[PDB]
Amino acid sequence: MRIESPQNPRVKALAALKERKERERTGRFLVEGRREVERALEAGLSLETLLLGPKARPEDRALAGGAEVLELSERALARVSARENPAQVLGVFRLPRRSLAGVTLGAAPLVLVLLGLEKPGNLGAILRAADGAGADLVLVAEGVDLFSPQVIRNSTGAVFALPVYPVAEEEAARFLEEQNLPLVAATPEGERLYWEGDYRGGVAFLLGAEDKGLPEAWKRRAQVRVRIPMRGRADSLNVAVTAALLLYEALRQRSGGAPL
Amino acid sequence: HMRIESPQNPRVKALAALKERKERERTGRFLVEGRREVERALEAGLSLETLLLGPKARPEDRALAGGAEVLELSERALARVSARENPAQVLGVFRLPRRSLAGVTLGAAPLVLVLLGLEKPGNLGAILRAADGAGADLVLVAEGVDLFSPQVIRNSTGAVFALPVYPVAEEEAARFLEEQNLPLVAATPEGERLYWEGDYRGGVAFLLGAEDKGLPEAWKRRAQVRVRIPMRGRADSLNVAVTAALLLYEALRQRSGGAPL
């Protein structure tokens, strides 16, 4: 069926999913863009409703897998979309309720722990790098919204691709100690170069937000503190960039490379 | 004390117009925002024409003026001129510098980054911060790429002032590399060598195209080796600035004693 009026009750409800409070109440979230819908489906997330605009391809309709397919008019589409140039494919997926307690880590895991909230767009970039390097788990700050239009768009759907859990600092500390994982803190003044850590047997990298840096409690908790060399005028890199360097160094060692 | 209070003051409007590249071209001037960015421009020998100080500037911020005109801005006048939600309290209007590629001398085994095409100012800025961090000897960017936008300056943390970055033409870039006798390493998603497998101990020019388009086939023919960043999940691409940082720090790893994979 099709819905024409932007004022239709179903459309208003779809547009309301732009707000975190409405997503948490209804248990649904909107995924905008063909690429992002593909990743949410490939990740096995439960599609409830597929929204198709006027210029969608025929292959787009076959993505529904039996879910409701609602064709929306451009006027209706404009209201639902979080974009200047709305996408022709959108999906309403069920919001997953997941607990860090349900997590069991495979062999020699690569874990990234982000402490504190970081500038917008940093998380999306980090998830892309984490997805690329094959990270097994990413812990983020307790207040992080993993289902916002922003994180979905900035991660290009990589947010769906891996286990990401927003947790309080104390929950993170407890989980890591339970897992008996060596903690490696990335700090500007770390005693060792980050190439020199041994990441072949599994590791949790500790990474702080630019505003405050790593709390001293976490620096002390680390088995090793490591640094990224800065040989120029700049004294630090963006936290997302630091994350990518660490992850790909750990992947380099898992691919046959030796610690420096 | 020369004070500007109203966002309606024509000078404030003119200062705010410097955000646009056309205005920078016409005036031959650009705005540098931030005490640390201003000091860096000054350390790099750039010419300061006008120092801007907000209501919360330090007393010693005045000691940066040299011979420049000093303008004290109200809080709301500062908000109009600034490119940030939380404006800096020290800003400087400098003369656009003239960069000559001829005076660049490279030693043996230099680390070079060649950025073909364009993307956003945020991306270029972050690439320059990584080049500064990794100690690149030279960065070449596409021909009409803007090195002195507020974004580039902010995202580079002012590293754009002391870093050897040059706007250059595709053919000029190609010839210069040929003149320098540097092996070209093209970073592409299709390359059949992981980037850790290249040997960057003796010098290298990395070739990086925009994430959207890619790399022109004329440049793909000039590459000695083609390398990729490995991608272990569904995505096969990362932001271009992230790829640049990964390549540069892999060369630095090898230069610090690490061996190619």
Residue numbers in the entry:
A (entry chain A): 1 to 260
B (entry chain B): 0 to 260
From the paper:
The A-loop of the 23S ribosomal RNA is a critical region of the ribosome involved in stabilizing the CCA-end of A-site-bound transfer RNA. Here, we report the identification of a third system involved in Um2552 formation, consisting of a methyltransferase of the SPOUT (SpoU-TrmD) superfamily encoded by the ttc1712 open reading frame of Thermus thermophilus, herein renamed RlmR. As several SpoU MTases acting on specific nucleotides of the 23S rRNA, RlmR is a dimer and contains, in addition to the SPOUT catalytic domain, an L30-like RNA binding domain. The RlmR overall structure consists of N-terminal (1–96) and C-terminal (∼105–260) domains (NTD and CTD) joined by a linker.
